[PDB]
Ligand binder design. Sequence first.
Ligand code: NAG
Ligand code: NAG
Ligand code: NAG
Ligand code: NAG
Lengths: 155, 275
Amino acid sequence: YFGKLESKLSVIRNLNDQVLFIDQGNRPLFEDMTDSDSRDNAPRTIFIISMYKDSQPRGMAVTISVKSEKISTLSSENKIISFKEMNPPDNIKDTKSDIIFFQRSVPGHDNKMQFESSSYEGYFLASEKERDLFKLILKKEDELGDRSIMFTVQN
Amino acid sequence: SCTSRPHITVVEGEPFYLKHCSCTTTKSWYKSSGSQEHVELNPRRIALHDCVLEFWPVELNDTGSYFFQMKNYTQKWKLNVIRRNKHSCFTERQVTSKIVEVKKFFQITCENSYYQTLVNSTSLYKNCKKLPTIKKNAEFEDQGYYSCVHFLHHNGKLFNITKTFNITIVEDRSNIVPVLLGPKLNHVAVELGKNVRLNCSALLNEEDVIYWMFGENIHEEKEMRIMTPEGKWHASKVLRIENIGESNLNVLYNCTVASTGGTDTKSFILVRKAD
Ligand SMILES: *[C@@H]1O[C@H](CO)[C@@H](O)[C@H](O)[C@H]1NC(C)=O
Ligand SMILES: *[C@@H]1O[C@H](CO)[C@@H](O)[C@H](O)[C@H]1NC(C)=O
Ligand SMILES: *[C@@H]1O[C@H](CO)[C@@H](O)[C@H](O)[C@H]1NC(C)=O
Ligand SMILES: *[C@@H]1O[C@H](CO)[C@@H](O)[C@H](O)[C@H]1NC(C)=O
């Protein structure tokens, strides 16, 4: 069992202080933004982080949502990052879910967070450059202390 | 790189570009304003080349939405140009915030991987006073606006490009690994007609969370938080089970504290009386 508890609004950033947002195509991407850019690209810059209770607690269990035109929840299904249009549910009757992630702060830096996928043990939300884009993807860990799977969570 | 976000705010008087993230083929740039549907851009201060749209410099003239098309590709930008503070070195909307903990690694570095080959000079300001890098461990008084400025050569006159960081120096929290207080396994005595109230208690952080886990009417909850004389948050929560049947008997009721920094959980089993 996973069950919903409270929510916070947040602005997510990567190792370069690039801001997470959802693009016209519903793709989570990263880009430099001034505070005025982060403010005026809302609601696509404002992520809902919802917390869940867990029967087998592995960290802080969470879902991640944005409100584009409708609400969309981040999924790890088939080892791929994507936005599914659904509301974070009151509860989830499984041990691993494509939409649950475990948030853990990074020892020595409380501002930094890693998000481990619950459906795939060992895999983490990450920032990758793909061609001219910067993308939020799922990846198994490369180096040890890999800065690309660490994020800051502000308002 | 390239410019992927739908909306963009820049300051008047400054060089600026728009790069469409797809890179002798057919390109087309278009502009919308109030009464201008899609004015195809064909400029004879604006330059169109190699899959980018340049402003030299950008102006209030230019606020409006922009569209790009390369056959199977299309893109849209709302461009909002803002007034520049002419009395100062930066303008308050164009600022990027940064949070850096007091006694900790802190850097600021002026760079541009686009306009770098045109740069002739690059000066760094602190609250508009000249000072290219600042490498340092943080002091409270490093709070301020650091402005990076870049002075550019372009076909007869001078341009500057300026980025500013609002640095806030933050105190560090005293963050605690949450602990539960008491035995990890617990046996509690009760009688079938009647009720039990299980108290669960923990040392945790402001942001931390304490909850019960049963199967999911004869159950209920509610929470309390008091500060210890050592400054820590003491939290507790009671789970009430009213008309106990045997269904309530050998099942583990887990209370948990869950933090971004760690977790602890403890189980309660309900027993009749004989032990
Ligand atoms: C360029 O910066 C100089 C010195 O920082 C300042 O005097 C001037 O207003 C800036 N130029 C423009 C066009 O903003
Ligand atoms: C800089 O930081 C202060 C303190 O948080 C804040 O009140 C101010 O609005 C910030 N400046 C800008 C331009 O955002
Ligand atoms: C639960 O335990 C805490 C810590 O022992 C105590 O301060 C509090 O009074 C108890 N709460 C209730 C409702 O009995
Ligand atoms: C937590 O409780 C569940 C159901 O109440 C139980 O099955 C489980 O084994 C408990 N967890 C641990 C680690 O003892």
